[PDB]
Amino acid sequence: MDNAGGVGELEKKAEAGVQGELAEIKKIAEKKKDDVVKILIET
């Protein structure tokens, strides 16, 4: 593992956090919203 530097780090970390965070938020948001809308409409 030699690939590493100010840029590669700032970039990798930037997208890492942004992606991970956004993904998670959309995961719980869509998950709960789905279960609610589903149980609501279906029942």
From Swiss-Prot:
Going by the entry's taxonomy, the superkingdom of the source organism is recorded as: Eukaryota
Compartments it resides in: Vacuole membrane
The Swiss-Prot or TrEMBL record describes its family as follows: Belongs to the V-ATPase G subunit family.
Job description of the protein: Subunit of the V1 complex of vacuolar(H+)-ATPase (V-ATPase), a multisubunit enzyme composed of a peripheral complex (V1) that hydrolyzes ATP and a membrane integral complex (V0) that translocates protons. V-ATPase is responsible for acidifying and maintaining the pH of intracellular compartments.
Kindly give any further remark recorded in the entry: Present with 2280 molecules/cell in log phase SD medium.
Q: How does it assemble?
A: V-ATPase is a heteromultimeric enzyme composed of a peripheral catalytic V1 complex (components A to H) attached to an integral membrane V0 proton pore complex (components: a, c, c', c'', d, e, f and VOA1).
Q: What is this protein called?
A: V-type proton ATPase subunit G
Task: Name the gene for this chain.
Answer: VMA10
Positions spanned in the full protein: 61 to 101 of 114
